[PDB]
Amino acid sequence: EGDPEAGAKAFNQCQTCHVIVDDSGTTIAGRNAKTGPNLYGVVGRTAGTQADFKGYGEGMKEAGAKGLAWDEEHFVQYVQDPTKFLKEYTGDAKAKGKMTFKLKKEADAHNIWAYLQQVAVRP
Ligand code: HEC
């Protein structure tokens, strides 16, 4: 279990590419980055299915087609090394992630998740 407060601060790194904008258009976190998908509603979301994002890689779509819904266990392994995670999960030797960024600290991964659990759950 992470700490939502430390998570919100560490989310600053993710803001270079991601935003968290709700369904009414309110910006919860971030500026205007569109390199990565909107993370609002990511908790429990089938991987690679945010309807507005058109930049998903084959590995990510394939992972969601094989039953990956984001929960803490997979999220933590994923942000630490996206490509390695995609290959393991899919069993596809050619899978590779578009997210070139890698989170270097494990404690941060849990913190950011606690923060997402707070502000990114769609009812
Ligand atoms: C730009 C260089 C990025 C940074 C910095 C971070 N992310 Fe990212 N993310 C980016 C892309 C281009 C993608 C698509 C990946 C693909 O292979 O298709 C993603 C995706 C995610 C996901 C998947 C969500 C989904 O809709 O299925 C997650 C959960 C995610 N990113 C989280 C995340 C976090 C928490 C970051 C900060 C530590 C982070 N990303 C940074 C691009 C970039």
- CATH number of the domain residue 26 falls in: 1.10.760.10
Number of domains the chain is built from: 1
Q: Contact 29/119 with Cβ under 8 angstroms?
A: yes
Q: What lines the ligand 1 site, CB under 6 Å?
A: 13-14, 16-18, 35-37, 42, 47-48, 50, 55-57, 59-60, 70, 75, 79, 97-101, 103, 112
82 lies in which domain range? Answer: 1-123
Rounded Cα distance between 25 and 40, Å, is 11
Q: What are residue 65's phi and psi, to 5 degrees? A: -70, -20
Cα of 102 from ligand 1 centre, angstroms: 9
Q: Contact 72/53 with Cβ under 8 angstroms?
A: no
Is 60 among the annotated ligand-binding positions? no
Rg (CA), the chain: 14
Mutual angle of helices 106-119 and 72-80, in 10-degree steps = 130
Rounded Cα distance between 11 and 116, Å, is 9
Rounded Cα distance between 35 and 47, Å, is 16
Rounded Cα distance between 15 and 31, Å, is 7
Q: How far is CA 39 from CA 20, 46, 55, 87, in A?
A: 5, 12, 14, 22
Is 14 among the annotated ligand-binding positions? yes
